[PDB]
Amino acid sequence: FTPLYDGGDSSHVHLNKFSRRECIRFVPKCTTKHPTNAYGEIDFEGYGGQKRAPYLRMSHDTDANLVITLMLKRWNLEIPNLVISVTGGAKSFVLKPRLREMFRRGLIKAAKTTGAWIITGGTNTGVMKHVGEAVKEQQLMFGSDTQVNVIGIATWGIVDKQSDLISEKNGKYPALYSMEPTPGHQGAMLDPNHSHFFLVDDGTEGKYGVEIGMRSRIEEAIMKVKTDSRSEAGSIGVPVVLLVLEGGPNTVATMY
Amino acid sequence: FTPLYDGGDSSHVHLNKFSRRECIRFVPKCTTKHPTNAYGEIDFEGYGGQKRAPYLRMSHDTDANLVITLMLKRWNLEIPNLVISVTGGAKSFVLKPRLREMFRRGLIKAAKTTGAWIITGGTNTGVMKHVGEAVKEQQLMFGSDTQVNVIGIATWGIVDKQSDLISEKNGKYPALYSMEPTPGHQGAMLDPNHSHFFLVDDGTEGKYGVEIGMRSRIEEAIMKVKTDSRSEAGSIGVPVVLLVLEGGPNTVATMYELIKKKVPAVVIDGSGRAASVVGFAYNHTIKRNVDGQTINVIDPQYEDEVRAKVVEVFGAKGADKTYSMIKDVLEDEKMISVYSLDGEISQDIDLAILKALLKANRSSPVAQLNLALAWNRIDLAKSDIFTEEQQWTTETLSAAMLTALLDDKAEFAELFLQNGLSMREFLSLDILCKLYAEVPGNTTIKPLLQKEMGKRQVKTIDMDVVGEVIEELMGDMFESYYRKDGHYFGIDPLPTPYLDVFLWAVLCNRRELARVLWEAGREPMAAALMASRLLKRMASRAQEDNTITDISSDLYDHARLFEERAVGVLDECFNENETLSQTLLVRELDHYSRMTALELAVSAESQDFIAHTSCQVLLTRLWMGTMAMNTRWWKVLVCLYLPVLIFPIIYFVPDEQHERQAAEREHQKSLNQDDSMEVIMRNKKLGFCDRIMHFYSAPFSKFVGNVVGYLAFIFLYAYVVLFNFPRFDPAKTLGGIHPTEIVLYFWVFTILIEEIRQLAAKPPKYIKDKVSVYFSDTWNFVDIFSLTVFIIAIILRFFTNSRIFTASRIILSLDIIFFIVRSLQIFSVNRLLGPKLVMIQKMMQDLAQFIIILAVFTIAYGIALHAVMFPSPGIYARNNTWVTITSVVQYPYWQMYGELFLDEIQGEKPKEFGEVDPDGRWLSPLLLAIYMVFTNILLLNLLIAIFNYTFERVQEDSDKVWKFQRYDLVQEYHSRPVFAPPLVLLGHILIFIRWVWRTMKIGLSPAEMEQMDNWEFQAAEMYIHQQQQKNSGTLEERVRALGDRVDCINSQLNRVLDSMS
Amino acid sequence: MYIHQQQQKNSGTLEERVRALGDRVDCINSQLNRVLDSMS
Ligand SMILES: *[C@@H]1O[C@H](CO)[C@@H](O[C@@H]2O[C@H](CO)[C@@H](O)[C@H](O)[C@H]2NC(C)=O)[C@H](O)[C@H]1NC(C)=O
């Protein structure tokens, strides 16, 4: 009925922590941009804890400033002091256990102490899996009090179980994304351990190099957002850093 | 004579732990198979402990299935989860002390943790000696609690002291096998450290290769025995593993023989001949000549001659055939395995043995997981079952999960949940019914389920039975959702999978499994309180019943653990936000029969939960029902009788909350340029007429009213008793009765009605159960006694007769005591007086014991005193029985308090007291003096010592008891009639009109209920991880972990020193 | 004098000595791992 009384400006944990912009969706395949069908949250099937990861499908021609507006205002995501872009191999690879342990200690310690975002490919294979597993067995060990924000910028033409995430109406905020792959798709699934998802549409399906443009244009957009502080001299532009594990010539092109 | 009584199915260690089959014996030497002479036990001559090792001689043509039947049934040997076959050198050999120590740590650790048999040659030389010595100085160090079964399969023609073991008759079970060898036999003795012996006959003597056939045929026989488990999917075939230390070509033949029967082999390098050759043959390189599912043949152009010469180091006659057998064993990469001392740091020999079996089942991961479950070793599951390489789903982990649940493998169930098992998909109705169908037998729930389905004649268990058992274990009109919800009768998944599996876990009394399932749940606080209720109620059920075994202290201890968890979650919720935690306590929970967390914490008598600050502040807020927090008693007292002052001077909850919100909106500016619970816990507003009824509906206003009305009653009743209570005469008007007494009848009738409606409004819905719970607290005895006594007095009053009128007025004039002493309940709302009134009733026991001892001394002295003063017949004999009986009790009693009758008990006062006997005149003060020592300066001072002793102990607990009783106080006055003491009886009628027409909680929205569940769950996570970090950071655990890291440093430096040398 | 005495009091507690001892043992273990890497 009426709003329940919480002692505002007295205690820390309020219940707020626990109808949209343009958001075009190319769904014709030549292209007719409609309003999006997929923008709720994902309850992954029983990997420990109660963690709803909000997501959104969007066209490849969407301006990055609106995505920053969506993250900061609409999703209630805090302004970061650092952004770690993890690029590398798409296919799964092996790390030596010492270096693996050192990697998943380093990345999460940097993210937790700094208060940073970690931007990754989003899918369940390659370097994205290592970042996901790092987040998993660092939150299973110490709990989720300082939540590390992992952003998965993936493509919509590859992700499995599309019909699971689709709904013409508003109110898709409960969604039940299963882990059993559909037989004979030839395309990856979403990572269970990531916190937020950006799914790039192109109309097409089974094409890998769709999210390369949006990744860069978002990474441009969070280099001109100013950090939060009381002083007007302390408000610096958000620094971005790039981290490399593997890849072909394409990662070296992205690096340069 | 008859069987001695041991408490079966109650305690663990029974005295059973502390006339045969065919059993042929070839004893002719051509062969005539007779019944065996040698099958008792062997007491080895003084090697420490009392260990009888049973043995049996048998022919070489005996079928292995009968030997398995003999082991499992006749010898009472448990079905193993692993079999380690140790082959090697027959003659004695030397191990390097590090490798020796590592060997005897590894073999016994594998055997103890897995629960395995170790099959060996049996004799006292070679590898058998190393296995024997390993067992000896691992049982001398840690004792024999987990007994390792070592089986010695030896030959009868070689063993010494045969005449010692032989007896034609039955009963050879005491035997004394000495260690001094017989001079000039040329044949080994038995090993002292082995547990069981199989001695193979052939008729012949002095022949070694007799036991080779039986060894293999037994090893065949225990590959088709199924392992013991509750699930029919968990019963795997027993895995066998082979371990090699040394040998000639014969061990390599045996190795290649058993590989073809799908038995893997572990070869120990850093030892003797055949192991080092096969090991260094394996140690070169890797090479797949053909695909062939990963085959190896390590023989390039480079390193053939090195293997040729190393084979030629020992044995020239047939170097090619033994080299062929050495290259044959290295065919399958999966089967053969080689342990070297310079391989890794963190790999011991037990890991090599078990990982060799996991390597042997490399094709199917399900078989590997079943082996990992069967052994109960989760480190292997973490190591090489659940890796990054392979993925697990619900469909693949279903059988493993069900096996993990039914066999009490809590850590595996935890691990399956947090890897790839989702209980929404896993748990169907049939699985849940299967879980309740396979309850152990030694639990408390099994009799209860049997008794419930015993009546109403139902042969198959279903959730209606389980629901009814859960209903009768929570007596306050609880309603389990199994009885009503459509999902639990007989596809979409079940509503609450974690909850009902958690309920199954707590009803079976499984501590670790219940903890695992509690941590992954939606309402931790409510579940913990329901758990503690279930545990302690079934504890009392187990205690008071003869046909259920007493495991009550275990169940109370488990209930106490869940009570601590509930308080811990509340404490963390309180530390995060103090207001919403109090909202959390009054949530109307749908899965717990519309019952709130505070009611659950009262149902199970959880004083630590109710005594917590959050509950106490909540109770004070409920006491101030829809009224400002700092409204004083006198302000209420004025407004109670002058309802025109109700609006100006009484502040309310909306007013103070509006003020706080209006202030906090301004603080954010820059410095430069029946709906009482709702209006308490929402942003609702009160008009004019609403905040009149809300003032009168508050518990505190009803309490102030009750106090004023009670004072009026006591003064009125004191007046009539002291001043004006005449006798009934029909001549005068009204019987000459003053109106005062009619007003007294009116108020006592009001108190009678109050007690009737206090009886009628109890939690159970059975008049016997209402009465039984109504007489739980001791005030209601005094209430019904005083009311009954009053009604009897007023009935006796009217009859107009001096004797029974005297009885009437005396009965009223004594009933004043009980009505005034009843005031102490209205005094007990105070913070300071309340605990003191609890302390008094706890001291009544010590007062009772004191009075008993005092009464014994009083009566002794009394009888002696009266007998001496007044002789029994005679001149001084007082001729009256009643005064004698009363005087014996009377005068000793008053003499305690300093009323010494010194003039009376001596000669003086002949008229008042009575004339005393001349010899009593001097006896009486002497007896008095002795009595005064033992009464005044011994017992009374001892009573002071007793009270001071018990006051500190009672001080600690009486406060909690007062804290807990505040709920009943608030709940009582919450339900009282709305109107004031003068008209309170008129108010009472409105409850009768509501009843003839035919509460402290709030209903939240689905969105809010979701938000509150999420916040509660995160608070529980904070508690769980803080407790883990508290238990890990203890000084002893830091020193222990520091010791482990120092051992790792020492091992690394040893490898550096090996790398130098 | 008061400030530094309080720092030296809080540092010299038994639990803090054991914790710091644990950190130095971890440093020794890491150094030996690098020695073993230098061997291999
Ligand atoms: C109690 O009764 C006895 C027996 O009747 C009385 O004892 C007698 O008292 C008279 C008068 O003093 C003596 O002459 C007798 O010798 C007494 N009898 C005996 C057997 O010795 C006694 O007086 C009575 N006591 C009281 C107090 O009334």
Ligand SMILES: CC(C)CCC[C@@H](C)[C@H]1CC[C@H]2[C@@H]3CC=C4C[C@@H](O)CC[C@]4(C)[C@H]3CC[C@]12C
């Ligand atoms: C406190 C210590 C010294 C013990 C005292 C015991 C006294 C009080 C006891 C013991 C013996 C008793 C005395 C025994 C004999 C007599 C003679 C005569 O007059 C009657 C009472 C009288 C006088 C007694 C009075 C009390 C008495 C004196």
Ligand SMILES: [Ca+2]
């Ligand atoms: Ca009552």
